[PDB]
């Protein structure tokens, strides 16, 4: 739901895998368990928790308070029923569905948000219900269930983009677009950060900037950064919050690897132990390394091992297997030679290869017109 | 009304009286004329609907449409109940 139980119950990832940080997460998880009817979530995740000595103490009170508030919402629903009104029943069934999202059961909340989803007099409250399924779909990390109601609720809006509704839907686009590895189309989503604000429902503003600084810092090149973020005053405002981000932006844009590799361990450790950002930690590292190697290797034709080793601050034995793996595996530039122990590339990728970029579509189109020949007579 | 009704003595005609919108007829038209624009979650439609008297339901449309301009002038994200009270004072001065 929109309560802080989404984040407190969202720390279960760092509560589960590492055993070092599993103390504060169970501290504010057990302390916050008396809030927002957290019984069923932590009872489901009880295998990753402590023993049953103190566990069975509060279950008897939470299981009876759940039935008490549940039967009070049922009596209020029966009082709202059999009466002339539309928003009253939507508020009763919607509040019941919000409590069923507090307990963390999407069966009665699925049929509840289905009933109040069918009682939507307007499309705005319908999109509000869709968002009510997205706020719990983030915790449930479902793929299609959160894209179906947004695919159906996306078209036929006709009421214009609000300041927090359409912007909130764009924030959700940042969420599921950060889950997926799509970057070249997700680089346009965070451009509306001027109208964004502190949203305690899903993600704080500083967490939204901290999450978009990876897709913006890695998924964008130097002209894209200079056009979007360097020209924009938003990162100039939010860089004063943490001095590290300014180092990872001015050091990367300044091409200083001696400090970027010394400080990159904070990006390595901070990159993991996250709910939605951990399983992609392997792609950001390699993609950022090959992006920096293409950045430095773009303006440089030949490169000696002395200036390279002093520039990157690492031994030659490691960059040997680095470029050796990035010739075939990386596929960034032409073949490299070591006849003089000097990185020397040619890169004839403009004159003839600029015309040869269409031969792939010519061969695939050739197989497609061979399929067109297969359609003939049958 | 007296001339047309003088020519229409209720022979074949549906007589439905059109009254001025009552309280509930101000809550529902306030919601129909409030979904189109922004609205906070800490506003009570009961009292703000009871504080919109005057001619008819177009006075509520004067509060909303003549309140979005104060949302523009104030340069805020949404419209608060105090802005709606200001528009109430404006439409009650225009009344």
């Amino acid at each position: 739901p929109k309560n802080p139980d989404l984040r407190i119950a969202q720390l279960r990832f760092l509560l589960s895998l590492p055993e070092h940080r599993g103390d504060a997460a169970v501290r504010d998880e057990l302390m916050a368990a008396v809030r927002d009817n957290n019984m069923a979530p932590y009872y489901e995740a009880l295998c990753k928790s402590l023993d049953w000595q103190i566990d069975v103490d509060l279950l008897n009170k939470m299981k009876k308070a759940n039935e008490d508030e549940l039967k009070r919402l049922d009596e209020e629903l029966e009082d709202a029923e059999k009466n002339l009104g539309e928003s009253e029943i939507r508020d009763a069934m919607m509040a019941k569905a919000e409590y069923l999202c507090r307990i963390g059961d999407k069966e009665g909340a699925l049929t509840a948000f289905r009933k109040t989803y069918d009682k939507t007099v307007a499309l705005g409250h319908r999109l509000d219900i869709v968002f009510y399924l997205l706020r719990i779909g983030l915790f449930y990390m479902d793929n299609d269930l959160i894209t179906r109601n947004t695919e159906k609720a996306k078209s036929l809006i006709e009421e214009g983009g609000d300041w927090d509704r359409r912007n909130r839907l764009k924030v959700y686009q940042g969420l599921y677009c950060v889950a997926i590895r799509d970057f070249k189309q997700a680089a346009e989503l965070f451009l509306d950060t001027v109208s964004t604000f502190t949203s305690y429902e899903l993600m704080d503003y500083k967490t939204f900037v901290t999450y978009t600084v990876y897709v913006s810092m890695i998924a964008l090149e130097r002209p894209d950064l200079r056009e979007k973020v360097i020209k924009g005053a938003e990162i100039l405002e939010v860089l004063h919050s943490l001095p590290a981000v300014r180092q990872y932006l001015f050091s990367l844009y300044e091409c200083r690897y001696s400090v970027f590799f010394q400080s990159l361990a904070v990006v390595e450790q901070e990159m993991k132990k996250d709910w939605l950002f951990a399983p992609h930690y392997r792609y950001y590292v390699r993609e950022m390394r090959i992006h920096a190697y293409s950045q430095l290797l773009e303006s440089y034709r030949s490169l000696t091992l002395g200036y390279m080793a002093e520039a990157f601050g690492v031994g030659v034995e490691f960059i040997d297997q680095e470029l050796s793996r990035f010739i075939a595996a990386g596929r960034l530039h032409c073949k490299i030679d070591k006849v003089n122990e000097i990185v020397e590339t040619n890169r004839p990728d403009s004159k003839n290869w600029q015309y040869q970029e269409t031969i792939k579509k010519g061969d695939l189109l050739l197989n497609r017109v061979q399929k067109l020949s297969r359609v003939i007579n049958m | 009304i007296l001339d047309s009704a003088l020519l229409r003595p209720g022979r074949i005609d549906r007589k439905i009286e059109f009254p001025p919108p009552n309280e509930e007829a101000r809550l529902d038209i306030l919601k129909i004329h409030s979904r189109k624009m922004n609205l906070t979650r800490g506003i009570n439609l009961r009292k703000i609907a009871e504080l919109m008297p005057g001619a008819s339901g177009a006075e509520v449309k004067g509060v909303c449409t003549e309140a979005g301009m104060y949302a523009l002038r104030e340069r805020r994200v949404h419209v608060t109940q105090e802005d709606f009270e200001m528009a109430v004072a404006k439409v009650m001065q225009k009344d």
């Binding site: 214009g160 | 189109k36 979005g68 301009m69």
Partner: peptide, 28 residues
């Protein structure tokens, strides 16, 4: 091939003119 007219034309005319899609983001 006064200040009533200057204020009304001011906020009703030049304020919507200096913004794009403002019609869309004012509750048209």
């Amino acid at each position: 091939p006064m200040d009533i007219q200057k204020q009304e034309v001011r906020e009703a005319v030049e304020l919507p003119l200096t913004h794009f899609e403002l019609y869309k983001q004012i509750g048209i």
